[model samples]
Target chain A: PYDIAVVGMSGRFPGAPDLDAYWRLLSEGRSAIAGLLDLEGFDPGHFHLSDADAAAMDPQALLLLEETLFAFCDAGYAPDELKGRGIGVYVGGRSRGQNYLAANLSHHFDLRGPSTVVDTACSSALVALHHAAQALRSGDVEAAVVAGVTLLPHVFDRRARGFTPAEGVGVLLLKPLAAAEAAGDRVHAVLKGIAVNNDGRTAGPATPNPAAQRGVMARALAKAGVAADDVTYIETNAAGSQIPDLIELKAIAAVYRDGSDTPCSLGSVKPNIGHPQCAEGIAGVIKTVLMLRNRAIVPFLSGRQPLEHFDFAATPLRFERALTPWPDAPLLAAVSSFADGGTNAHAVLAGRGRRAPLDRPRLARRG
Target chain B: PYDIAVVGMSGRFPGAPDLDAYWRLLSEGRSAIAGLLDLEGFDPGHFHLSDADAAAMDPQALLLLEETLFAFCDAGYAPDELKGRGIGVYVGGRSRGQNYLAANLSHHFDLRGPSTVVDTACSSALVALHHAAQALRSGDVEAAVVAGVTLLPHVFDRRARGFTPAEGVGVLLLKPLAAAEAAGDRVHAVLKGIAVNNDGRTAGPATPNPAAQRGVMARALAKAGVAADDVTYIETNAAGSQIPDLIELKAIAAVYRDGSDTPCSLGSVKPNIGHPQCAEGIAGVIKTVLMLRNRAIVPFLSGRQPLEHFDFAATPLRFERALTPWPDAPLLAAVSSFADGGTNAHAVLAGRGRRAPLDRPRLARRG
Candidate 1:
């Protein structure tokens, strides 16, 4: 199987305007669930669009453009250098003209490659990542910009159970591992393998299937040629629902239970930033990449008690409840994102060296 | 390149209730442009759903279910034979929870393969077909059901000049050609090649790019390893717009122009069935398949005169204005579908045997 390098990444989450702030929030174990993000400072002039055009454009598209530019800059590629390049753009969402975000990116960047939008509900972003990797491996595109965005008008009230709704945007610049290494691009992490599958014959249309979840994780591990025991952490799609969270945990346990003393640390970014819907998968991935780079595990924020039925001691899976330093070398991790419509996706990643002091891209400060 | 066989197909157009009616509307040079389709008789009980569930479901999803079952039956597979099989479902549209349609089909049929929705606007269905073919080639799924649907409440008035809006549903059952042949399946047509690309740096986000169009067509031809001159007809994405139609024609001319006396017949199904949005691509593919099976060229329904800029005498491209016999054997055709967001898709297909007198699926008359 071909490996894809996550060369660069950018995103915006609740209570965090940039990746640095996001990491700080995660490490501090603080919840950022709040009202909708304010885009008052967003300027379309940066992308050379008129005010009316910007107003008419989907807010998700606008956010994607800004974040994609920032991601490219982070990858150290100038706009002129990428002109006419076969750099495909794959977006994940359910917005009307969702392809416009992809096409608009290609138009602005002069990327004459395959551009499309993949909608699989919450798992859409990871599914988009899987497609991007496949495109890179197939040589259909020289590189890829995989993005996900969710912008809803209203947030859930405090009394609401399950996951709180929120808005976010994430972008990742990816290339074949050899190509990225040959170009000496800074690698955030290496995508070893990814798999997507649906929960066939579930009880209901919106019901989650534990067997399907386990199957996807196992398939991804098999594709990566990595043993479940080797993975030390997992960023899950637990969205504050006890039943679903338990289902996901048991699924993880079924796959990673090796009867070893060491357990795989588990966490989710949803509790920290609320569930950003379509953007949740990429948000989880971005968090995992940061943890890999920093050589530490971030705390999983939770105010409620652990599910009664799940016996954490019996399985090699432990929720990371506090920030902890990861002493293991050559860190391996996985991310699981499932949708309301039974579409499940899982990805395996291998970490690189510890975080090094680096300069933030100039566009990082811009809205 | 691996070839994918279109084993079976089903669709419902404006004035057509099933494939037979759709073919009749095309072969007679008749237009089906009318008001919203009367789907009042659609029953959810056929699919084992309750009245409330049916009412709550997106009409597009309901239509897809009916068409997909018809397509599967047309492919000679009973519901039990496909149960627990890794038959993937890929839908193309811009509806909320579009993946639900794919997932729902998988659930009802016990298909445990990848299920996703690809949204590239008008080109979505062809793009869905391309992904389905890739999945089959990659051994990710045993077979695939590629579908597209469009359902809108109101129709455009007479003053609308570009393209009339319409509702439709189309589904195709695909498998690797060798596999389909080994199974002794009735192959409707063989997908030789398909390509998708974005109009990089176009004049406007919605503006079409002639170069990109030409590039996609040429790429599809190259992938098919078929010469442009060998193609006898092209099903285009001309939606009754003069400038866009001219751009498409010139792009076709640039790719298929061989300076030969015999010209390739060009046509559009928009005039007959109106533009079915996401479903238009698959509808065109089905129409091309019918033409190939009949060994004849269907008329292009147009009330206005041809574009003045396109010189028919200079280019080896002619619009099919009347029903004509196609004396050529081993018919080769291409379908081009473009999106408003500048995502262009082209597919090359090779026709199989002539139309065989076949029994319509039992479910065909239900709706």
Candidate 2:
């Protein structure tokens, strides 16, 4: 098991240009779910791409380029510093036109590390994080740059496509905790533990199962050597859909059943910035990290009456309809994301001040 | 750390409908490299898909469905047996119209393990194999249904493409060796070890690096606890491309340069059938497994003279231009695959009769 530190992060959401803006939008409950990004604004010169190639490249690729540069700068690492180092690039998101983004980044940045594009639908990014941790622990690469990019489904017009569509790119720079400390890097958050599993025969392929959801969260916490009661917040898989939302809530409730008097806040970034498919996991990770740093739980625009049958008062899962301060405890958050398939991923994060436990729980509770 | 056994296998190549036919094509050296598959040949009802939904779904998804059914039948297991076994589904392939094939398979087959679609360009399938081995070793799933599928690029009509555009799907049923042996499962091949890495600033992004290729092979060999001289045959990553082919050959030669009197025969399935993009790795794997089972290295269609600059006589690597019997030594074959994005994957396969060495080699030789 490797303790991976999120040293740096940069992203572009619907209305937010950077993490600061994203934080403001999240805390204020501002919705950035309405519009699509302008794909034509990219300049080929910046990425050393020919005009013809740039035109032919997927807009998602350009978005990755723009955001990755911001991430490097955010991490305060000169491009030359990574030149000969084995910096692995793991992009867990959708694959549209440029199925070759990893290669593009490797060549353009002169990074000669293992680069791969992992596609697991909504949980792609989180799964990528899981693999990144594995690679880091195995000593295959010194650093891992993980990117998750998804474009709005309805690009041009306001066509009701069932789910809310949004374009976003989120990149996180990760290093082993020991290495990060040795290098004196700014650690945004520590990814304590992660668990990925499939909800075998839970429901239909597209359906969500409460048991599987609970299983992933429980497993992640056990892996992190933390108890469910210790979790202060949960970035949920509530994509505003009726079934998935209720299922996720039940799972969250199940895990936090043995909780303290301080309620475990529940929040979903989907309502705030729309569900950008594969990129949703990273977006949620970034939000949870921001909340950890600020010690605040953002509001979820809650005017529309809560969905029927999900009795929020019965469980410790607190839906944050209004901005609220987190409990005065060592900040720990668990983020859950699931794909259309059964692959479910849960990642636990802790604030810089909250050191991870020294040992992992030997067994997972039966969820 | 875990021994994964390939218990069952199924696939559809250019001119072959099943593994038996594929093996016949390989041993006979009959070229199946011609024409694309008819995308509309899917039987939706067989997989429980509606007519409209099937038409809307990517042909690659249909291919996966068909091949997976064949794999289950080949493995002699019923769907009910895997219903709640937490059978993982790991797909390594391209994502076109419908990227939800994994979900569809899970729903249709009632598989509840971690299902994911892994995309790593050309090496996608092999990378999927790598991850499958990881999951099996980690006890994340009871069995893994690994699929690699790729449809022709611009399927309808490709004006001028560099590599061959072919459509195919390959599926393997994997389980822990002890479990498979106890269950009386027919083991087709033993996956000894796998190593995946990047070229790290090679000549270019798409360009292959000799050192990285050499590194992955040496790493895989070391991980499998096998010496370079122990490898009896190699399923080369010669994709017929000028640079990649030469680079892959050079890497193979470099790794096998111990000057063993028993030459390691080399052959690639690409020239037999067109390159199936993301599915190429599995295709090569299926070919190698068939060769190992048959104890013969089928001839490569040697129409053109050998490429310039590659001296086959100097190294232990021998190009198989005619049907030849494999040495009596326990059959062991290594397969190497790479992606346009710098991710290079190598898998060392041994016949079921050959036990892996008990200890792993501690160091990898500098390539």
Candidate 3:
């Protein structure tokens, strides 16, 4: 199994303007879910874009570029340093003029690798990550910048019986695990395996299929060369719909539940940051990475009563309602992201031992 | 380098209802350059889709499903026979609800592999082909169905500075070369190599980069284990814009023009079918494959005056304006597709020995 390192990451979620704030929100179990994010002060001149062109461009595209620059800075590289390098740009979303996001990155950053925009609905970002990982494994590109954004507000809350829609953008810099290690890059997390599949012949086009979800998770575990019992946590796409949530829970239980006397914590970032649509997957990944780095399990905000169909006592999976210290073992976690159109993706990430201090200098800061 | 066989193909272009009609249009020097195609009398019942769902769905998505079924029939498989098989579906285009095209295919066909929608603007279709090829190479899927469609009306004519946008949908069933041969499947043409790149820091996001174009072709050739001179034909994305056309021609000349004394023919399907936007790349591939199978070169429609910048006499490349028989040597050709967003893709295809008869029984026919 080839490993891909998440060398750098940058994001702007509902209440969090950046990764530092995002981590703080997650670790402190705070909800950033509101109506929308206020995008007020954007400067096109900083990116050398004309005012007319920027005026006509999609805001999601503009947000992606800004986040990508921040990600490059987080990786300790100037945007100009990567010019002419074979650095691919993969953006996931259904933005206005969908291809513009990746293309704009290539144009502004002078990256010559493959530039693509992928859409699998909510699972798009993880799907983009899957493609990026494959490209890195194939030696097609030296490195990759993957981004996902959603300006549309939309979900997971029991109180609301649906997810709250929020606006956010997330970007990650990925390279081969060995290469990242050699470069001494600050690794957020190591992606051990990823798998994508569809729920063929589902009840409806928008319906979720449990078997497909189970299959994806199983495949991801197999590819990671880890047993299902080894996965200690799962960040779920629990978008507050009762039936879909139950389907997801059952799917998770099918593959991850075995009588090993070990508990697997289940959590959802949706409750904290709402659903970011195309950016949902990356948000989940960022949260999981943060959890791994801190070596702690965050809380899952749910209704007073538990999900009706799912029996938490019968399975090893438990929903953590408060922040808890993780076991002193090399942590393995899985993130599940699903699209409304039956496409599903699962990623297995392994944590590096011990949390490192954020000592790196920031290249740019929010005004 | 692994070889991928294009086992089955299906498409609908202006003035061409099927592949047979498409071939006739190309071989007879006919242009299907009308404003739009009338997609009348489409039956939702044939695909088991409800009338309401079909009506609500994107017409491009509906067209893709029909063409996908035709492609499967062309490959001699009933839809039900491939159920639960690990076959991926990759649709390229910015369809209304971009992910629906692929998700619908997976839902109908019971495909349990990856389902993705990719967009790189005009080059989206070829980019989908590249991803499918990689999946096949990686053994991620046993087979793949790749498609591109454009319903938007829009030219390769001197009278118009821009291309005439036409409606078209194209689908191809891809399998490993060895697998196709072993299964006794009819191989249309073998994909030797493919490469995708972006024009980093271009003059504009929409502007074409000659160096990047040349670099993509060179990389494709290197991957194919074929020399530049060994390429006998090039199917270009020659939209009618003078500057872009000239840039493409110069890039082709830079790569394919060495004193090996081999004359190479250049052609564009745009002049006949107009430009199908996202489907343009696959249209070019279909044309090239048809030419290879017939061991002939088709006519390229052009205005009275030649493109000003290109010197045909100085290079071995000449635009074929008539149907001409090909040489007896093993045939090798290249196809170039570029997106408006600066992403570029080039593919190398090699012809199989001897023309084979189309003796397989077609499962369905158009009314």
Candidate 4:
């Protein structure tokens, strides 16, 4: 009852128009990196913007509308149902670019709570997620719509090579667990606890420090009242970047070392759909929730062979080389988000009832 | 001692090169909206930025360095003194553009605490101020640097004319009042309490709602444990706009409706140096502290003839038509910041002990 529940989730990843498609891509181990969006096709009429004004508006803002609509629909709430409800909108990553988008949402949906965009680089959405959890705990609003988005650089240059330049948007509808239950909302997963911290001077600026990463993850676990060994899986902040990926893996390994003898699977959503920068945290969150909902974990290729320099044998951590089912009930997972500028965030996700199984693509699709 | 103290404040305003110059422009009641910046003259070598990277960086990020440097110097802190000290940097407004700048600060200063950018539009810095207060009260960081900056629209057109396209950067150094006292830091003014809220559906989106505005100010006052009658002045979010100015004025008038019999002087810094977008709230804050420290209320030429539609005379509000000294002891003031997109923020400032007169400002200047 003290935790926050993820009632609804929506996102537009590169190859996936919606979560159903996203699930398919993940389960099949296909990458969405090749898909590029034509970001200039938003309808100004729908958002009440003039043609000139809409065209001049940032594409990121337009994407927010699409994601917001999808999320509300997924939550089964109509515009009329949401109107006048003090629903706070807390977005991470690209708050500045989405002023027009947030303004449009406030106007169109008639939301009355706080609307803010926060950035801590790649950890942004999770930081925003932490803020939302605090607000819910403080009774600031009845509901909160938290999201993040980032655009891929236009050209494929060296800067974009280390990891795939990414593009996508993510939005989640959240409410206190008790309220969501009373409202008959379908809970995808429970956000037990979240924590955020800066790398400090412990590491090079913008470089990941394994100790800080471990510290944040452990804090999150402690807040959730979860034992480190209880964490069965880790949704890492790995985006195929060599250094940060290894650093994140080392932190994960270190976190579980003291807790359990059982092996914990390690994976990331970034390699499947590229990295969504500010939106990447929520993207990782969504994937973790989906995996928690579905008992089975989808395996991805890469870093699977294991790095010779790393000492995973010393800990309970291992890469999921094949699809695996939940080892036991009361499943728990952790997500770690690290920013290039040393900000780090970790969220411990606890799953409740099993998800209604993916029965032949039943999730709705929106154009 | 229950409030956070503004131990150090600095800014680079138009026409006026620094806060001292800004105070001169304000005390003299001269308009600074006419002063435009070159936006390209920052020194690369001083900040350890390569000329090529500096040129490629967003001009807004470079400006942040200038403001951060000014604030630290004003706080009498050397870079070495702050290293690994867990000092947080909380900025409002354009968090996206300031990424490179924040990275530079962490690298140059070797700060290890949180570096974040938050946005609530024109209310950005004040919202950031509230966050800094929370972090300090919670002991998350020993000290915090809060800032906000807005750039004049590069190519001004009709859209930019909503308010005089204004630009400026501002930063404040904050710590627990007790800590400041213990450290013998110069206190500009004590931050009583701060509150933020969204206009919600009670008003049109992006439109100011008087009731919500009043609610935030009242909440801030209550948090500060200060009575309405105790407030003698308010630094308003007046950017020379007709409706918003009226809305902000009404809110201020309503807050003091029952407490004070005499008129409370109302003014804004926007007229003195234009509205600095994301930085507007802190600019108002900097102005209030200067006024609080100087024990003087500077006048600004405005719609002074009085609006026939508003009932200011019936309430305890009046325009400061000339420079006036402290109306009473234990000097108290408030600043109101409203975002065009509906978020609102208010801060109550209470000053104790007299400020050492400017004394020709022995602060060091950085190129």
On a 0 to 100 scale, what is the lDDT of residue B303 in model 4?
A: 53
Clashing pairs in 2: A112-B200, A112-B201, A200-B112
Model 4 reaches what TM-score against the true structure? 0.84
**lDDT per residue as tens, model 2, B32-128:** 7643654447677766667788767777787787778778777777666767567878888766613466766776787766676767777888888
What TM-score would each prediction reach against the true structure?
A: 0.89, 0.85, 0.92, 0.84
lDDT of 1 by residue, A14-96 (tens): 88888888899899998877335666545777688877887788878888887887787677776788888778888887676
- Top candidate by DockQ: 3
Q: Compose the digit string of candidate 4's lDDT tens values, residues A1-367.
A: 2589988888878788778888887877788774354454666666566678766767677678777877877777766788877787877755443455455566567776667777667888898887677667655578889988887540111122345667878999999988888877879999988877777654455466777778778777877887777788888776455556667666676777555577888787766776678888988898888888887788855664454456767776766756778877358988888777778889999886322322221322222
lDDT of 1 at B212: 84
Q: Could you tell me the TM-score of chain B in model 3?
A: 0.92
Comparing 2 with 3 on TM-score, the higher-scoring candidate is: 3
Q: Model 2 fnat?
A: 0.47
Per-candidate DockQ versus the true complex?
0.59, 0.34, 0.69, 0.33
Writing each residue's lDDT as its tens digit, candidate 4 over B7-118 gives 7778877877788888888888888664465454777677666778777777777777777877777777766677766677777766443454455565566665567776
The candidate that wins on TM-score is 3
| CAPRI tier for the interface of model 4 | acceptable
DockQ of 1: 0.59
- Local distance difference test values of all predictions, in order: 0.79, 0.74, 0.81, 0.73
